[PDB]
User: Which sequence fits this backbone?
């Protein structure tokens, strides 16, 4: 019954900056909202009830303001651990409805990654498949390119990619580019390289390995 | 049951509600509408009563010399008089507003009861402890229709008159 | 404390009945309402509904026709049962406790950990673990990198622990990525002092629940 | 026959409040508006350096009583603490007019 | 907060508690 | 308290009254007795509340010299404290008395309804929305007899009995 | 709010009560329970209102010299301000609380008549003069059972049914 517009979907703001999330509602709800912080892959943690009742133990930097149909969640000093998705629930009328959520990220100093290459497990090679991993730890921002150069030849595809979410402590990202190619035991040729191109690098860095 | 009989410890989802008992069993269920209005009102009341007390900036005490004893006693009188006045106001309004809060809750009980009564006048017979015994059968759907303000009296008026005229 | 754990078989077939059980420790269920809520991965949260032992349940309309909520006070659990699970019904399920009346209305303070329910015609394919070589190839000073590779498994629930939980720092259990095979690959990496690479042994414990597989493997330099 | 009843809420709270008609009325929910816990904590307020004159009266501190040299260089404060009975005041007998102003 | 002479100023937000 | 649903933009001649609907047509008509009582009460209330405020005038401020800073602060404190006290009294009396005024009017509603119900004990039937359907014919003279509190129950008791029991 | 019909000068043993008329005669008899609750409440209310106005030690007047004129007008202003504040509080509290006392008493009337209503639903007939005529014979024991809230409706339900149906 009660549709929810929680603006804006994605935010990034440096440490200490005030943050405001608006939670517009379809009907009159008095002040009966809740604000939840769902951390990545964790249970949501109730930040505010009554839209103005800071739950016990929650940092006093959080403040809920409003009544009726418009409401705002305001973080006075954004901190690293405040990286999460923030939802607004409503308990005036069933069905209880959540907003689409707002992703709060943190602007920080641009940081170069740390690159490490992991060759395919011989145990895996016995199973007729092969996969080599490029690893980029503790970089910023998420925007980087990890390309693959086998026998001095860029692979069009055959590479998937997983990006960790922002570390709660460091707010630094980590990425793994997995090449899943198997010429039986990649019995094609023997030069394999990780073209890593990131903003925190003046020139791209290429680590490499050969057959054993 | 504001003083008629007792309250319900098993009903933990609101101030006010119903205890239903039909073929499909029994249970408690809070009335969210009236409970919500009561929360709204009591919240506005508490905030208004508390927030209405703002005082000017004062460094309270004063000490006056041996040639200003009259000057002195007057300042101590002013300090202690503002003390007495704010104390008197707080005390009286706390007493009066706790009285009025209990009475407001009583009136909400009364209004809910009268609503359920007006929905079912001759399809049910009043049990003296804030209850109703149906001359018909009020299934879960019927109970919910009574609870959200949409009971259908002609729907059960036939069965209720039959059972009523036989019972009596 | 009151603690809410969640058990769901997962990989329910597209026209079957989902059965989810939330187990409750530190609270007699008979005197509390119990709520179910859900999240379609990156999508928002949805209130499934409310149930009580001595009360009347209320459910979300879109799921009303199909949801039944029950409570076992004997085993201290409560269960969802959803008939004819659709593809859209694939999501994360959470169970929460409905606290009693407060001056700020009713609160849900206490939350389950979340279990994934996938709706698929596919099977419970067990995972394949392949260790990751040292970053000895990459001269990185005292910093060194180790890990494992979990591949070839359709149900997504997968738990990586290190030395059965002893290794707590510098861990990057990556996101699972769907391969062209319709299976998932999942890398887990830990950064470690290059000194300890001899005096310490680094084991991964991987517990893929649907396949009920619990493979543990060593990572050697 | 079926029954449908009406009533209000009860709990195990023992919070008692006073009304003018009736005292010690146990209510389900209430709010204490009175903090009455002067805690052993007596400290500064805004992390300032509240200065104690020790055994010096206000007049002794302002005039520069020679035994009040532990006060020289005590430049800033959130407030000032003075004992009811200091030892070092206006040592040569006299008064500071408008001491109180 | 305001200084007063009272020893107890808890204000009733709820209705009377009557068990059973 | 026992509030109602609905409003009567057409009744322009009083706080309270009736909407009659008989053979001779329908119409609004204000109850002059109860509205007259309510206006008397509210007038006397406003006058009492305001008259209590009326007390003596006094040039408020005082000026003190450089050797009188302290009695100066005490005088400003006194001015400002009387300002707060009177402000707070006015604010709370406004608030509480608007509350009690709406409650007084609600009670007048209830009293009028119960008077009419006592006149028409069985000869009519409570609709529920706040009206009555007659089991007999109530023409304009009957309507007026009910309105000025002189309805004749035995006059229509037999007609109402016949029709009422014909229903069941 | 206002619930009045008429007074009984002959009932001299309580604020509230009953006038019984059966074949063993007629008489007035006060309800000690509701009267007792009312006396308790009014006594506590009066004592709270009075005892809150406590007295300090302030020889009121001050007489200042020719170089303390503004001091002197401040002190007279303080005296007159405390005078006006205490006068205002006393006047308004007396007015308000006399109103509330009468309303409390009216609600006690209403609650007693509701209790007698509830013990006796169809076994008696209500009258617009706020009374009941039994459809059966209520002797002294029956009267006392109603007065101490222990009337037995099924005991007389059949006799009252017979006579009530006999009327028509």
Assistant:
């Amino acid at each position: 019954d009660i549709q929810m517009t929680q603006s804006p979907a994605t935010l990034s703001a440096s440490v200490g900056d005030r943050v405001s999330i608006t939670c517009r509602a379809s009907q009159s709800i008095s002040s009966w909202l809740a604000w939840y912080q769902q951390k990545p892959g964790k249970a949501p943690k109730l930040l505010i009830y009554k839209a103005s009742s800071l739950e016990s133990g929650v940092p006093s930097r959080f403040s809920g303001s409003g009544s009726g149909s418009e409401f705002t969640l305001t973080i006075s000093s954004l901190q690293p651990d405040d990286f999460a998705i923030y939802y607004c629930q409503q308990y005036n009328s069933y069905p209880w409805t959540f907003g689409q959520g707002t992703k709060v990220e943190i602007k920080r100093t641009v940081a170069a990654p740390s690159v490490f290459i992991f060759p395919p497990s011989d145990e895996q090679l016995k199973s007729g498949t092969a996969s080599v991993v490029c690893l980029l730890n503790n970089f910023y921002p998420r925007e980087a390119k990890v390309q693959w150069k086998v026998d001095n030849a860029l692979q069009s595809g055959n590479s998937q990619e997983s990006v960790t979410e922002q570390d709660s402590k460091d707010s630094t990202y980590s990425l793994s580019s997995t090449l899943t190619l198997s010429k039986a035991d990649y019995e094609k040729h023997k030069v394999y390289a990780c073209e890593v191109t990131h903003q925190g690098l003046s020139s791209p860095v290429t680590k490499s390995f050969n057959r054993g | 049951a504001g003083f008629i009989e007792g309250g319900w410890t098993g009903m933990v989802d609101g101030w006010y509600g119903y205890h239903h008992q039909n073929e499909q069993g029994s249970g408690y269920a809070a009335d969210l509408k009236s409970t919500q209005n009561a929360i709204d009102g009591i919240t506005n009341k508490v905030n208004s009563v508390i927030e209405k007390m703002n005082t000017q900036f004062t460094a309270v005490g004063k000490e006056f010399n041996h040639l200003e004893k009259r000057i002195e006693n007057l300042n101590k009188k002013v300090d202690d008089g503002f003390l007495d006045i704010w104390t008197y106001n707080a005390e009286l309004l706390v007493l009066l507003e706790n009285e009025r809060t209990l009475d407001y809750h009583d009136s909400n009980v009364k209004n809910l009861y009268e609503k359920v009564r007006s929905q079912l006048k001759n399809n049910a017979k009043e049990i003296g402890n804030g209850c109703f015994e149906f001359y018909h059968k009020c299934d879960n759907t019927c109970m919910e229709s009574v609870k959200n303000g949409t009971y259908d009296y002609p729907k059960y008026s036939e069965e209720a008159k039959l059972n009523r005229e036989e019972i009596d | 404390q009151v603690q809410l754990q969640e058990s769901g078989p997962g990989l329910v077939k597209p026209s079957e009945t989902l059965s989810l059980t939330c187990s409750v420790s530190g609270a007699s269920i008979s005197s509390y309402y119990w709520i179910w809520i859900r999240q379609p991965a990156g999508k928002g949260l949805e209130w499934i509904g409310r149930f009580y032992t001595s009360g009347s349940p209320n459910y979300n309309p879109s799921l009303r026709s199909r949801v039944t909520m029950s409570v076992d006070t004997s085993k201290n659990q409560f269960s969802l049962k959803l008939t004819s699970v659709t593809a859209a019904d694939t999501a994360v399920y959470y169970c929460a406790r409905e606290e009693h009346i407060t001056f700020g209305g009713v609160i849900v303070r206490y939350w389950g950990q979340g279990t994934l329910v996938t709706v698929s015609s596919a099977s419970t394919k067990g995972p394949s673990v392949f260790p990751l070589a040292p970053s000895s190839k990459s001269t990185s000073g005292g910093t060194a990198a180790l890990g494992c590779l979990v591949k070839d498994y359709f149900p997504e629930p997968v738990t990586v622990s290190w030395n059965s939980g002893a290794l707590t720092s510098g861990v990057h259990t990556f996101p699972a990525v769907l391969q062209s095979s319709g299976l998932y690959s999942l890398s887990s990496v830990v950064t470690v002092p290059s000194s300890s690479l001899g005096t310490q042994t680094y084991i991964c414990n991987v517990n893929h629940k649907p396949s009920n597989t619990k493979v543990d493997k060593r990572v050697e330099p | 026959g079926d029954t449908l009843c009406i009533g209000y809420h009860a709990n195990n709270s023992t919070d008692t409040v006073d009304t003018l008609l009736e005292k010690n009325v146990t209510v389900t929910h209430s709010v204490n508006l009175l903090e009455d816990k002067h805690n052993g904590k007596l400290c500064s307020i805004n992390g300032k350096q509240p200065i104690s004159l020790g055994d010096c009266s206000f007049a002794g501190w302002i005039l520069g009583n020679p035994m009040c040299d532990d006060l020289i260089g005590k430049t800033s404060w959130s407030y000032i603490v003075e004992k009811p009975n200091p030892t070092n005041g206006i040592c040569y007998p006299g008064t500071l007019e408008d001491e109180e102003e | 907060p305001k200084y007063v002479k009272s020893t107890k100023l808890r204000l009733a937000t709820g209705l009377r508690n009557v068990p059973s």
Summary: DSSP finds four helices and four strands in chain G. Chains G and E do not touch (no CB pair under 8 Å).
